[PDB]
């Protein structure tokens with residue numbers, strides 16, 4: 001029962017300290033929890049995607065141990081190797097578990113800028129850097145064999161390095177901490193945010209994946225495209 005993050009609902013599978021929810025035949029959401037100190041549990045979500053005989057991960061859990069539990073769940077439930085992981089910015093809820101991925105021999109990718117900020121944010125950098133074009137699309141040579149993951153840098157928003165990921169062959173796109181749900185009362189932690197550019201960045205994410213109907217985000221259950229539009233409206237007020 002987290003203080004922040006979606007509550008458990010029908011069909012959620014508890015596995016150790018984590019929760020897994022199937023979103024599509026080949027896509028699952030992973031959820032892990034961190035107690036912030038007298039405030040209670042904060043849930044954070046990422047994705048697991050099956051692509052033929054391999055698995056792709058978006059975001060770590062908060063900690064190495066939680067991330068190792070995600071790999072255990074994949075081993076038990078899917079029993080295919082993880083080819084790579086993409087982390088969406090250099091903060092604990094998205095990159096806290098890097099060491100567990102590396103110990104497992106999984107290739108890790110992040111925005112070059114995330115890797116550059118990682119030491120200052122108390123994170124371990126990914127082993128490979130993604131770079132982006134002037135319109136935000138990933139340079140394909142930096143994202144080799146990404147299968148259905150379509151990586152897009154929408155512009156500075158929640159952080160300057162935040163990236164997003166569409167799942168090709170599905171109607172799902174992942175906004176990470178940039179996007180908050182359609183009924184959110186705030187944009188969350190704006191401590192590292194670009195308030196000037198936030199609204200345009202949120203709308204750019206919506207425009208990059210214009211037919212994604214299921215929007216997955218770090219701290220709420222998957223939502224409609226109203227998550228994008230509501231996030232942008234909140235950001236318009238900054």
Ligand SMILES: [Cl-]
Nearest residue numbers: 091177189192
């Ligand atoms: Cl944050």
